[PDB]
Amino acid sequence: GAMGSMERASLIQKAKLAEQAERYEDMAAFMKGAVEKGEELSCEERNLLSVAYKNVVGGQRAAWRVLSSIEQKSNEKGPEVREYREKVETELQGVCDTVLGLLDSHLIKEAGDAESRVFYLKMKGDYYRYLAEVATGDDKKRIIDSARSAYQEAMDISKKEMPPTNPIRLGLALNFSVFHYEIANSPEEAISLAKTTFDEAMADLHTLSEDSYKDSTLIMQLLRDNLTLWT
């Protein structure tokens, strides 16, 4: 690809320059090139990959929601709002297909510590969820099964191998809970998972360092804001 002739270390360095310059499309392209070198990513490198793609797809999701809202007002005209919505939607799908391609071709493996395996399976659930927000029909149903199945595998690993207060384990449950409520039409499962998650972590907070107490309690607060919202 376009990054094939560049050294892995140089791609990582430019990824960090792109981040400082707030050039997230460039940052994502440098990180994809790094990933395509075939070596595993460090924890710091995974987080660069994630931040880069999350900023790019986050901008497209925001634009899509602006346009989809305007589209629904003016269906209660002209084809322009729908056409431009479809154009943004196609770009968002392209990004998600890129990320899911990297996860399947390079990053999701049987080996590696639990933190990394869960990190990538969670990411897969998340990028299928972003596809599910714009999908319809039989396509949407297939996407919902793919998301569920990635999230579920990551839940299985994180119950076996991480403590209930672990921020990755907590972030995974927060995101899966959002999936249940907003995508899979399962409000009962959403509320239930978020409560179990919050409660099992509450049980261990007294036993944590002051750092861990804060990290965990930030995510616990998101779980609780969502519960307020859903009940």
Partner: peptide, 7 residues
Amino acid sequence: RRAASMD
């Protein structure tokens, strides 16, 4: 209102 997901 949309539910919140990890950051």
